[PDB]
Amino acid sequence: NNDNPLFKSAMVALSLKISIGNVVKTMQFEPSTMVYDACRMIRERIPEALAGPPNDFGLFLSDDDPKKGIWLEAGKALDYYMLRNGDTMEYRKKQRPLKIRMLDGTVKTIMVDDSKTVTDMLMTICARIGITNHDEYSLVRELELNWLDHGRTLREQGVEEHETLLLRRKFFYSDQNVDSRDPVQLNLLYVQARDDILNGSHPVSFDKACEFAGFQCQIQFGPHNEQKHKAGFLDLKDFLPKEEVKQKGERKIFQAHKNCGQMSEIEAKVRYVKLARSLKTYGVSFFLVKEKMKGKNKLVPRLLGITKECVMRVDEKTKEVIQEWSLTNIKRWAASPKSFTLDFGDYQDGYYSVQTTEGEQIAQLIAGYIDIILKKKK
């Protein structure tokens, strides 16, 4: 009855659904068309494609799993991306707002290039707020699960466009100085040290935790009063690390509280910070790993600590430092999604190989600290 002059064989042309907001139009493309030229063709056919300067827009191949969506490169041909008839591409603004929690706790929205890695977005953030040394910072989620691989994209790590991230200064021993003369700065150091102890990222023995809590009582309640500060008074979850919340700790806390005497709030904060910094565990990033002991088939949980100068094994119950290796004496390291391994060359016999789901975190920390020592050499 009638033939169609528009028809091209399914094999010689690509038929793609182009989406812009709620608008969707099916368009036909020669498969060798460069992404840059396909955008021009879209601008000629979809009026909502003209909603801004032409080079502000690009092509995004979406997926039902958002972690698999990808931006197309402007110099590539469409058929490089293995597209087939019926696939859906988004004509999409290349920059997008990223909400970042600033160092003063407020949230600032920052336009970033949505096709880039977390490192690239961190650099854009630091540029906007005047931070030249972006290597002193990183982005983390605020839901462990919060770590982000800065060599990968937010998207492939499950971070969608709605989520606010935290700009976080890395730990520096040089960022600290205990002076009762600056009360505001003393309080920030106190709250940082206290929160690390209470949330267990600074692992301490049960005896030490009750000592810290004794200073905490002086700070929060003033000198000990045996009428008010009696058995049952304390909400022990606010004074002891999660894993160490035990009724038998209260009597020890009150003794440490009593031993403060009439110590002032300022002086108790100084002493809290000093006690924390006096521990070998202070400032160390710890990972709970599982070790294989000779002569036991059940693996042994152990705390593995990474610092700027060494790697350290710490007993999980007593928090005693069992063993230390200097970063200088590590020959190589390896990480998989389930394990982490250290090779010490001829410094010892056998590798140190542990089960953990945070091996990549550990490896990047070691690699980071090793580069710093190198950059300080040349």
Q: Which of 250, 277, 304 is the last residue of a domain?
A: 277
Angstrom distances, CA of residue 65 to CA of 28, 159, 363: 25, 12, 29
Which two tokens mark 188? 């920030």
In a domain, 344, yes or no: yes
CB 375 within 8 A of CB 367: no
Sheet holding 332-335, edge to edge: 321-326, 310-314, 300-306, 285-291, 352-355, 339-343, 332-335
Query: Which phi and psi (to 5°) does residue 316 adopt?
Result: -70, -25
Nearest to 113 by CA among 131, 128, 129, 103: 128
CATH of the domain at 160: 3.10.20.90
| Cβ-contact 343, 332 below 8 angstroms | yes
181 and 249 assigned to the same domain: yes
For residues 180 and 159, membership in a common domain is answered with no
**Which of these, 242, 263, 240, 267, lies nearest to 252 by C-alpha position?**
240
Q: Do 233 and 247 share a structural domain?
A: yes
What's the CATH number where 301 sits?
A: 2.30.29.30
- Domain membership of residue 305 (yes or no) is yes
Rounded Cα distance between 329 and 321, Å, is 18
| Residue 321, C-beta contacts closer than 8 angstroms, at least 6 positions apart | 280, 281, 312, 313, 314
- CA-based R_g, the chain, Å: 28
Same domain assignment for residues 162 and 219 = no
Cα torsion 224, 230, 236, 240: sign: positive
* Annotated resolution, angstroms: 2.1
What residues have CB less than 8 Å from 200, skipping those under 6 apart?
241, 242, 243
> How many Å apart are CA 36 and CA 204, to the nearest integer?
58
Do residues 148 and 59 both lie within one domain? Answer: no
Domain membership of residue 4 (yes or no) is no
Measured CA to CA in angstroms, residue 202 lies from 125, 218, 287, 303 at distances of: 29, 21, 11, 11
- Within-domain flag for 336: yes
Method used to obtain the model: X-ray
The full 3-state SS of the chain, as one line of letters, equals CCCCCCCCCCCCCEEEEEEECCEEEEEEECCCCEHHHHHHHHHHHCHHHHCCCHHHEEEEECCCCHHHCEECCCCCEHHHHCCCCCCEEEEEECEEEEEEECCCCCEEEEEEECCCCHHHHHHHHHHHCCCCCHHHEEEEECCCCCCCCCCCCCHHHCCCCCCCEEEEECCCHHHCCCCCCCHHHHHHHHHHHHHHHHCCCCCCCHHHHHHHHHHHHHHHHCCCCCCCCCCCCCCHHHCCCHHHCCCCHHHHHHHHHHCCCCCCHHHHHHHHHHHHHCCCCCCCEEEEEEECCCCCCCCEEEEEEECCCEEEEECCCCCCEEEEEEHHHCCEEEECCCEEEEECHHHCCCCEEEECCCHHHHHHHHHHHHHHHHHCCC
Does any domain span residue 7? no
Residues 115, 195 within the same domain: no
Asked if residue 251 belongs to a domain, the reply is: yes
User: Among 126, 152, 169, where does a domain finish?
Assistant: 169
Residue with tokens 């009582």: 217
Which one of 59, 93, 127 terminates a domain? Answer: 93
Q: For residue 108, give its domain range.
A: 96-169
Distance (Å) of CA 226 to CA 135, 234, 240, 257, 320: 51, 13, 21, 11, 34
Per-residue buried b or exposed e for 48-85, using 16+ beta carbons within 10 Å of the residue's own CB = ebeeeeeeebbbbbeeeeeeebebbeeeebbeeeebee
Work out the angle at residue 164's Cα, subtended by the Cα atoms of residues 160 and 371, and round it to the nearest 5 degrees. Answer: 90
Number of structural domains the chain divides into? 4
Cβ atoms 256, 218 nearer than 8 A:
no
Residue closest to 183 by CA, chosen among 273, 101, 259 = 273
Angstrom distance (rounded) from CA 153 to CA 356: 23
CA atoms within 13 A on the CB side of 3: 2
Which CATH number do you get for residue 190? 1.20.80.10
Distance CA 35, CA 23 (A): 20
Q: Does any domain span residue 6?
A: no
**138, 122 contact by CB (below 8 A):** yes
195 and 269, same domain (yes or no): yes
